[PDB]
Amino acid sequence: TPSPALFFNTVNAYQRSAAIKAAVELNVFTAISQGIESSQSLAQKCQTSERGMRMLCDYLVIIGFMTKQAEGYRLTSDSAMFLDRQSKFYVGDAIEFLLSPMITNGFNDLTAAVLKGGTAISSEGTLSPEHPVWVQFAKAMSPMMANPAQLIAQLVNEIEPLKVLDISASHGLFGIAVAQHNPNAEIFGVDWASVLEVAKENARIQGVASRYHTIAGSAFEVDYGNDYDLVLLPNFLHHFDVATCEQLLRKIKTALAVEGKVIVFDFIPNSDRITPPDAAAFSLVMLATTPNGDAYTFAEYESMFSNAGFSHSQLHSLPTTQQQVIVAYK
C-alpha cells in the first residue's frame, strides 16, 4: 500500500535534531548513565520541569536513544558509550560544530542554494578568510578524527617521512599522529592562525610540540617550502571547485621531494553518487555551505591529480573508518 509517511517524517525530521540538541545540552544521558532513572529524578538532576523531561525522554525512546522500563528510562548501549560524559568515547559536543548556526544557516534556504548553484550564505559561506566555524570544528570534531589519524599514520608506516605538510591542519591530529609514529618527522601545519592555536595545543598535549611548526594563512597564498616527503589533505578538497583543487595540487607538487606522496582523507562517494549514503549525502552539505564545493568521486579526484601532474593515484577505502583515502605519487 502507498504511504505519505516518508514525506511527513522527513518534513518533521528537524524535531529530532532539536530533541538531541536539548538532551545533550541538558546532560540527560550523563544523568541516566548505565542505570535507570524516572523523569522525576532526571528533572531534579538536570534542573528542568518534570513534564518537560518526560516529554523529551519519551521522544528519545521513540527515536531510539533509550528504553522505557517500569522504573524509568535506560540508555541503549550506543548512548551509554557515545553520549554519557562518563564514557571515554563521548562525542556529544560535536554539536558545537554540527549544530552551529554558521553551519545550519546554509540549510535555512536550501531552495536559494539550489536555484543559484551554491551557498546562499553571504560571501563565500564557510570559505571566507579565517571563518570562526573552523575553530569550532577543530575543538569539537577532533574526538572522531583521532582514530583515522592513527590509521593513516600506520598506513604511512608501510614510506618513512622526515618532512610533512598538513594542509588545513585543523585540530592537527593527522600530522600529529605522523609525528607520534615517526620520531624524526618534522610537521608543518597550514591553516588560519586561530585554528593553528588548537593544532599547537594538540601537538603540545601529544608530546611533539618541538617537531610541530605552523605556516599561518591561506593554503593558496602561503609559501610551503619544499622537500616534503608527505603532504596530508584531510577534509579540505571538497570545499573547492575542480580548477581550484587543481591549482592547489600543482602547488603541492612543486613542494614535494623526489619520491613524495599526497594522502587525501575525505568523503569519496561511489560513482553512483548515492553510496555509501553518508559519503554521498555530504554533497548537499557542500551545496548549502560552500560556493562550488562537492563530495568528489575517486574518478573525479584521479583526474585532478592526473591533470596536476602526478603519476598515479590509488583509492584506499579504509573499511574500518567512515571516510576514504587517496594516495597520490609524484
Added chain:
Amino acid sequence: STPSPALFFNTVNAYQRSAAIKAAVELNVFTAISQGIESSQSLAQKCQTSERGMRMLCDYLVIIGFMTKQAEGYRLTSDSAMFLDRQSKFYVGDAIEFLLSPMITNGFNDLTAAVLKGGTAITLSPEHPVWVQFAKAMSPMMANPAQLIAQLVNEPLKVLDISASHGLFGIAVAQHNPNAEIFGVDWASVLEVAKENARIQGVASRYHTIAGSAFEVDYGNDYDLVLLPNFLHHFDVATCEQLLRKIKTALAVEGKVIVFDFIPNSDRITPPDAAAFSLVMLATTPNGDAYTFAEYESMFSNAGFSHSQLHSLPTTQQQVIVAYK
C-alpha cells in the same frame, strides 16, 4: 553487537532532510519528474534552477528514499508519484505551508528552554494566523478521517463542530446526513475556509458559523453531536474540563461528543506518531499534551459525562473517543 554513534550523528543532521524536502516541494521537483524519467539537466530547465543544485538535491532525495536514480535520469517512487506530484489527486505536498511554518519551527529552535520551563519558550493567541494556514494546508489529510467519522456516526441532526478549521468534519456529517444542520465554531478568518469548503461540497445552506473563541462564544442548545477534531491537545486538563462542561450544557438529552486526536497508548511511546506529538505540544503551547484515553476518560468523567469509549480507528493515523451525556 558493535556500538555506533550513527544514530546520534544522523539525528543531529536530521534537520537537513527537512530542508531538502522543503526545497523539492517549493521547486516542484516531483511534479516535474511525475511518472517519467528526467535527468538533472532536464529538471533544472523545467524548474528554472542550476544544474548542479538540482543534481545534488535529487541525489540526496534518492539517498533518503523519495526517488530512484536510473541510467537516463530520476524516477519517482510510487509514494512520491502519489503524494508529491501535483498531478495526483492525493497530493499533500503543500502541507509544509503549516508544518514548516516559522510559527511551529521557532518552538523547536528553543526546545531546551521549553524543557526547562515545561512549555513553550516563544499558537493559542487569540486568532493566530497560523490557524488560517492549518485550515488551508492540512485539509487534504483530514478528508478521509472526516468521511470515516461521518461513516461512524451516521443514522434531523444538529451538529456543533468546535475549532472547525477547514470545516471538513462537520461538512462530511452533512454530506452523509442530508437533514443535518452544522454549526462551525472558530475565529472568523478561519471560518472563511470552512465556508468555502461547505460551498464546494454543496452543503452550504446547512452550514452555519459562530465566530470567536470556543471558550467564550455561545453555542446554543440541543446538539445531538459535538465534534472536537484536533483541539483538546492544545490545553491543560482544567481548561479542557471547562470546555467539556460548556459542551455538556449544549447537548440534547441523548447527545454525543466525538474527539478526534492523537491518543497514545499508556506507555506514551506507542504508536510512535501519536506518542511523539507531545514534544510538539511542549514546543508550541504552554500546557498542551498528547493525552491518553485514561486522561480523556477522566476529563469527561469530571466534566459530568456518563460514559466515554475508545474507537482506535486502525484505518487512520489518529484515534477517536465517543463521550455520552
